[PDB]
Amino acid sequence: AKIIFIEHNGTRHEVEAKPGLTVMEAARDNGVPGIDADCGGACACSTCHAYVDPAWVDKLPKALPTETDMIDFAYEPNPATSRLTCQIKVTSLLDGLVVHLPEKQI
Ligand code: FES
Numbered sequence: 416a417k418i419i420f421i422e423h424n425g426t427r428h429e430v431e432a433k434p435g436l437t438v439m440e441a442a443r444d445n446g447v448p449g450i451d452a453d454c455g456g457a458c459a460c461s462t463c464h465a466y467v468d469p470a471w472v473d474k475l476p477k478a479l480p481t482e483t484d485m486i487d488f489a490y491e492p493n494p495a496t497s498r499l500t501c502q503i504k505v506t507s508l509l510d511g512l513v514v515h516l517p518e519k520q521i
Contacts, residue, residue, distance in 0.1 A: 418438060422516050423449075430442070432505045439500040442463075461499060490520060
């Protein structure tokens with residue numbers, strides 16, 4: 416599945432990710448800048464935060480309380496598009512998924 420990461424400045428990064436990996440791993444293992452992922456996908460750091468493109472928000476699983484509580488700590492969270500990428504599992508249906516990276520991670 417192809418996953419597209421776009422930095423806050425418009426720089427586009429494309430990666431191919433096997434179903435089963437998380438979007439965070441897809442970015443981390445392929446050298447995409449803008450994602451720190453300090454806690455390693457344990458949903459406890461909010462440094463894997465990204466804005467899902469509106470065209471894809473409804474195609475993703477609903478966020479769990481534990482995730483939303485963490486997003487509150489993220490840098491400039493967006494109520495409609497913000498997600499923790501380590502909580503998004505890649506599947507063939509997400510082929511073409513577009514994710515916008517924030518200016519900074521906290
Ligand atoms: S990598 Fe820490 S919450 Fe996603």
